[PDB]
Amino acid sequence: NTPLSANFVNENSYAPNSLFAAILNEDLLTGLSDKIFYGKENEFAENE
Amino acid sequence: KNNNGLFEIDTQLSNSVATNNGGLAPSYTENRVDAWGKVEFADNSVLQAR
């Protein structure tokens, strides 16, 4: 029910294994900046 | 300025609005697209031509 929640991920599929269709925010797709900036919040832990 | 749901600073419009010269409202300049846009009048020779 809330985003970014899934602490467990296994591995990624060989081929498409789902149907999919979606409604998009055409405004937000127009409004978003050209360059995405990630940071240290998306890095793996530097030591154990 | 709202851009498709996300507000971003507009530095030219900020400077345009902030240039009030101590008055209550932004300056008008004839040769500049300022907070009041830009207005060019037709020459008076438009009345004869039309």
UniProtKB/Swiss-Prot annotation, chain A:
It is found in: Cell membrane. The protein is the major adhesin mediating the attachment of this mycoplasma to the ciliated epithelium. Belongs to the adhesin P1 family. This is Adhesin P1. It comes from Mycoplasma genitalium (strain ATCC 33530 / DSM 19775 / NCTC 10195 / G37). The gene is mgpA. The chain holds residues 675 to 722 of 1444 of the full protein.
Curated annotation (Swiss-Prot), chain B:
Coiled coil: none annotated. It is found in: Cell membrane. Disruption phenotype: Probably essential, it was not disrupted in a global transposon mutagenesis study. It comes from the Bacteria. This is Mgp-operon protein 3. It comes from Mycoplasma genitalium (strain ATCC 33530 / DSM 19775 / NCTC 10195 / G37) (Mycoplasmoides genitalium).
